[PDB]
């Protein structure tokens, strides 16, 4: 009798949610942006190519100075590059070569990485000794670590394959907050620009908006039919975009609690590995499995699709804070800066 | 360039030569995925080949597209003990029908040969798998299990499934992996020559 009542209550809660969704939508974004100037063509060019290796390049990250770049590769290397002069500032060997993510601290003193070892490793860049030393090894996740993002030089937020996100203090070494509610493996995070909220995407074809200082799931977004691989905030912090294995990007709003845009195409069925916005929106840059990056108009249909130079699939892509450059890392062991 | 800029370029070149030295050292190594917290890495060496076995046990399979080979281990005696053979063949279908794993060889170890020989004299296969339609002898049932595993491969023209039987008082169980890795290296060399 308890299971039937629970199923009835869940069904009526979902039906009330859907009824709230239906009255919330009256006009789509395509009906509003049908009378604005379309962005014609973006002709990006590879300005710099950061090379020298053979192992495939997993996730990268930018600096807040828009100058230094960090990249993690399958050869157990974390390389910190100077993008203006192509010089490698730092080379950091990793204990585990199966790294899936990397982050660069907003202050610039720390880098982080993690992967199949279930540890978030924090490395100090500014030491009197002269070399990069491991500050901390955050342990506690029971699955592979898929994304990590710094809030400051004290706290970090991580997502893992145990359907769980975590907020850690990087001096004590303990999980300050544990975010639960996903049923599949969460593999993407995006921190808000004010660092009060974050959003995550899991194997359950769902995205969740979490409150950092309150420790609870504010919103749940049910869009895609497949695994959500990438997620990214809009610059204003009121919307986000998701890329999935169904060859479809989707733009959701936090306040409207609904999906607005569906960026789809009828030429490839390749999944999305990475998404990022530009400084003002208007350019959703999505990397695919077809060795290419497509540039979508965030308020319309496809615009450029021009980032064509990559021998293998674009595993990662990022946009600088000043918006000058877009760096893409692919599995051909090559980082390319595009402008 | 300024003075500090040239010194920074010199530092970058030193990092370049260190990275190249590490790459030349790691070019010998062979990565194998063992199927059958975190990873369990076991490193050994055979005939100037450094083998790294990563004991790990559809979402973590996207981090292993560059492995040399997959060592799939099956204990036969689980036919006599939810059937484990059905889960094994479902896993083998999952590891063979992947779109990104269409050219990765599999070394199929079939252990518990003596236990299966002892259990096949008293317990026939008709209590578990009565559709095989064959004898109850050791060799015929072993060949039936091997061909039942091998028939699950679809489009056997790019990769090859290597079936070996476990042995104790010898070192041929490493020599089989050495031969399979040598064939994989030969195919990769023809790929690098632009001739295959």
């Amino acid at each position, epitope marked *: 009798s308890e299971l039937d009542q629970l199923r009835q209550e869940a069904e009526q809660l979902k039906n009330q949610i859907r009824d709230a969704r239906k009255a919330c939508a009256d006009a789509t974004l395509s009906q509003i942006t049908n009378n604005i100037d379309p962005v014609g063509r973006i002709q990006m060019r590879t300005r710099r190519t950061l090379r020298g290796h053979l192992a495939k390049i997993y996730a990268m990250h930018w600096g807040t100075d828009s100058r230094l770049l960090v990249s993690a590769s399958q050869d157990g290397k974390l390389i910190i590059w100077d993008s203006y002069t192509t010089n490698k500032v730092h080379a950091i060997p990793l204990r585990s070569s199966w790294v899936m993510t990397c982050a660069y601290a907003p202050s610039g003193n720390y880098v982080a990485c993690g992967g199949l070892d279930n540890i978030c490793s924090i490395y100090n860049l500014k030491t009197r*000794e002269g070399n990069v030393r491991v500050s901390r090894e955050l342990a506690g996740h029971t699955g592979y670590l898929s994304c990590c993002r710094f809030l400051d030089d004290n706290q970090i937020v991580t997502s893992s394959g145990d359907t769980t996100c975590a907020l850690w203090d990087i001096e004590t070494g303990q999980q300050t907050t544990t975010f639960t509610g996903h049923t599949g493996d969460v593999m993407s995070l995006s921190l808000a620009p004010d660092t009060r909220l974050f959003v995550s995407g899991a194997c359950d074809a769902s995205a969740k908006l979490w409150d950092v200082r309150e420790g609870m799931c504010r919103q749940t977004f049910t869009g895609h039919e497949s695994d959500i691989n990438a997620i990214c905030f809009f610059p204003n912090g009121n919307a986000f975009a998701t890329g999935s294995d169904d060859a479809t990007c989707r733009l959701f709003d936090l306040r409207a609690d609904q999906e607005l845009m569906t960026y789809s195409h009828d030429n490839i069925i390749c999944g999305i590995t990475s998404v990022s916005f530009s400084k003002s929106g208007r350019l959703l840059l999505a990397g695919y499995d077809d060795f290419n990056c497509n540039v979508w108009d965030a308020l319309k249909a496809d615009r450029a699709g021009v980032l064509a130079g990559h021998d293998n699939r674009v595993s990662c892509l990022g946009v600088t804070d000043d918006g000058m450059a877009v760096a893409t890392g692919s599995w051909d062991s090559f980082l390319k800066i595009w402008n | 360039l*300024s003075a500090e800029d040239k*010194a920074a370029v010199e530092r970058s070149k030193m990092i370049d030569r260190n990275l190249r030295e590490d790459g030349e050292k790691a070019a010998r190594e062979v990565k194998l995925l063992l199927l059958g917290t975190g990873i369990v890495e076991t490193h050994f060496t055979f005939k100037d080949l450094h083998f790294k076995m990563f004991d790990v046990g559809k979402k973590w399979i996207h981090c292993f597209e560059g492995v040399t080979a997959i060592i799939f281990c099956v204990a036969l005696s689980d036919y006599d003990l939810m059937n484990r053979m059905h889960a094994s063949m479902k896993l083998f279908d999952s590891i063979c029908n992947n779109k990104w794993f269409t050219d990765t060889s599999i070394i199929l170890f079939l252990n518990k040969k003596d236990l299966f020989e002892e259990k096949i004299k008293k317990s026939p296969l008709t209590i578990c798998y009565p559709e095989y339609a064959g004898s109850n002898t050791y060799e015929e049932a072993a060949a039936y299990i091997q061909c039942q595993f091998e028939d699950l491969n679809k489009r056997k023209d790019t990769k090859e499934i290597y079936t070996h039987f476990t042995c104790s008082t010898d070192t041929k169980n490493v020599q089989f992996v050495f031969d399979a890795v040598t064939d994989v290296i030969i195919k990769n060399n023809l790929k690098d020559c632009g001739l295959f």
Partner: single-chain antibody
Amino acid sequence: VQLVESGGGLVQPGGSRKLSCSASGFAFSSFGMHWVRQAPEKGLEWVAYISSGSGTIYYADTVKGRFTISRDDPKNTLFLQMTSLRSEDTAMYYCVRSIYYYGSSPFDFWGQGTTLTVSSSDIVMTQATSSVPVTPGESVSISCRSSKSLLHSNGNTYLYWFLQRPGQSPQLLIYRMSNLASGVPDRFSGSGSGTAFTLTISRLEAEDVGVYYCMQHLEYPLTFGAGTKLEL
């Protein structure tokens, strides 16, 4: 975190000696290293530089052809072999570590110094002020001038502010202007452009007395100025 000098002593003119410096507490092989003199009553002058990995070795024109700077990385040692010594070479020698990448802090640590006595183009860095009397609690400005502009096309202005307390090694305060070195209190500030350069101290304390030096790093014969003395 330690550079201990050795050698020194009294040497006859026309002789040779072998200054050594032992480095500890830091990754020695990643650092370029410098030898800098100080005359018994005068300012600092650069002598020699060896790069990390010994790729680049640069000398001063005074000591060129007579001095040889080398390093033994696995035993963490710097060497200066001085042949054909002169009465101008009576001085106290300092060994300085120097790191070079984007955002680095070169000339950050200085050794104690070793003294030897020998018995009986370039950018000119000018400090027109010296022997400035001062009381604690007052803002102090120290000026420095350069013969040519120290602003590169990179947007970097390579001028360095060091302080030498009485009976102490020079300590790096400013490496590029408005980049305060590690461990330095936030009352020292650096400003200027091109030729003109200024170091200001807001709330002066009693530990800030001593001689202040400005050095350029734009060109390889690194040049100092006759420093400004701040006394109570």
